[PDB]
# Entry
Amino acid sequence: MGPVWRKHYITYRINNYTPDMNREDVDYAIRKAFQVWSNVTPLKFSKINTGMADILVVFARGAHGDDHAFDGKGGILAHAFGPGSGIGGDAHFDEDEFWTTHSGGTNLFLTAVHEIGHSLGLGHSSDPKAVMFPTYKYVDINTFRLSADDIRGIQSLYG
Ligand SMILES: NC(=O)[C@H](CCC(=O)O)NC(=O)[C@H](CCC(=O)O)NC(=O)CCc1cc(-c2ccccc2)no1
Ligand SMILES: [Ca+2]
Ligand SMILES: [Ca+2]
Ligand SMILES: [Ca+2]
Ligand SMILES: [Zn+2]
Ligand SMILES: [Zn+2]
# Structure
């Protein structure tokens, strides 16, 4: 078992907003992505604008201060650190992608579900239908469901 948060109340903060989308839509995408994981665990997530957030949500490009640079449009879409202090748990999204609420560009909600998976301690799945499968695939957002494998994984960690 890899690192896990040692508490069930977890805060997040949106450090900055991509100009690709309206602010309200970014807030909504992120809130709904956390909700996907809270629905199958004892974890609760609260958004704060001030103070010490556990999970910082960041949009940045290229080399952005951690040792994992982004690569321009395409390729790496985002990445996240496992549970831990400071940069631990933080999720970074490549601003060189075009973030959307839909099937065009890269869907922020689906990507955030995957990255939050990592922020909570999950690794990759070999189930092509798992949200934790390594490669991005748009799926109908209104019918989205975690796979049984994603649920097994997160339930093995919490709690
Ligand atoms: N390789 C691809 O098909 C796309 C390319 C997207 C593009 O070119 O615009 N890139 C990616 O998929 C990059 C690949 C990183 C790597 O090179 O290993 N993946 C990543 O950056 C991982 C981030 C992520 C995965 C998902 C997801 C997974 C399952 C279901 C739904 C969503 N959502 O975000
Ligand atoms: Ca953190
Ligand atoms: Ca990229
Ligand atoms: Ca962008
Ligand atoms: Zn980063
Ligand atoms: Zn991943």
